[PDB]
Write a protein that binds this ligand. Sequence first.
Ligand SMILES: COc1cc(CC(=O)NC[C@@H](NC(=O)[C@H](CCCNC(=O)c2cccc(I)c2)NC(=O)[C@H](Cc2ccc(C(F)(F)P(=O)(O)O)cc2)NC(=O)c2ccc(Br)c(C)c2)C(N)=O)ccc1O
Length: 303
Amino acid sequence: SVHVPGPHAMTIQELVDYVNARQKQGIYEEYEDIRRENPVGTFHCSMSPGNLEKNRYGDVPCLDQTRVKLTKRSGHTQTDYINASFMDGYKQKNAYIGTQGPLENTYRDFWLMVWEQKVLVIVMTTRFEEGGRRKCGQYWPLEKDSRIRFGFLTVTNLGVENMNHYKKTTLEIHNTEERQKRQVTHFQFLSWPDYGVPSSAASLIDFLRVVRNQQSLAVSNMGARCPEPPIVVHCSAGIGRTGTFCSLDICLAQLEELGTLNVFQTVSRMRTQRAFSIQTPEQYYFCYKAILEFAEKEGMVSA
Ligand SMILES: COc1cc(CC(=O)NC[C@@H](NC(=O)[C@H](CCCNC(=O)c2cccc(I)c2)NC(=O)[C@H](Cc2ccc(C(F)(F)P(=O)(O)O)cc2)NC(=O)c2ccc(Br)c(C)c2)C(N)=O)ccc1O
């Protein structure tokens, strides 16, 4: 994994002084420096003729080096492309698959990926539309007992539960080709504001804990094998909220295990796997602020 502890990780005390020395504008400038760096890798496949219409945004292609390839077939007329990238987690290879919100012409590709990668948990961080801007297609059956057929894959809704900050949907994926069934849990975070970033990270971090626990539970009940299937995480382009969710998970994981973390390191590293991760300086600043807010809630900060 590219996410290893350090070099030069910081303690909470050190992070506090770090952010205080730079202030909000200093953190914003730091994001711009990351932003300016030349991407590490190429985007030929994502921009190649034939895969263009599979991208929700022409300005958000995925890296050739880390893209998730579909093991489709010949004749059926299609490609092995999907705008999705394997992303490492804290001391864990391929902990996530960051991807865009599925398009009607990619719904089947999305589920094929979920099946092939043996995914057990899907994390959605947006609504279908926000402020008139489309961000995700309705790729799953919304109500209990409803089902959608995607060729040889049938997805059925086994139950829905609305929480104060997220919605949990249990789905059954039936592969008629292999004659096998699997259950996947779909989580939709509901508290990310239409504008800006969350005013408090408490709900997002609690949601992360729920996701972590379900992945752990699902893994414990799955058949012997991915070294731990990846968690699919998506937002409109699969870089902003997706990058934030994943960066926080990684930083908090290191913080829990060693009491240290490095936002700059984590984000720089993540951008070499899911290009363009963290889309605005506000989101970047939010990563720092969320960690500091978490520290205060955990009683780790003296003013
Ligand atoms: C610090 O000073 C400040 C600076 C700002 C400016 C700012 O943030 N704005 C940046 C803007 N980002 C942008 O432009 C990005 C571009 C992504 C990076 N690519 C490249 O650039 C690129 C492309 C090809 C090759 C190479 I090498 C690089 N585009 C976008 O903003 C969106 C895609 C997008 C990304 C993220 C999100 C999200 F955050 F909401 P999410 O959490 O759901 O994912 C939503 C949508 N793009 C599009 O709408 C779109 C679609 C089709 C076509 Br053709 C084009 C040209 C654009 C954004 N997302 O906002 C604002 C306030 C400040 O204070």
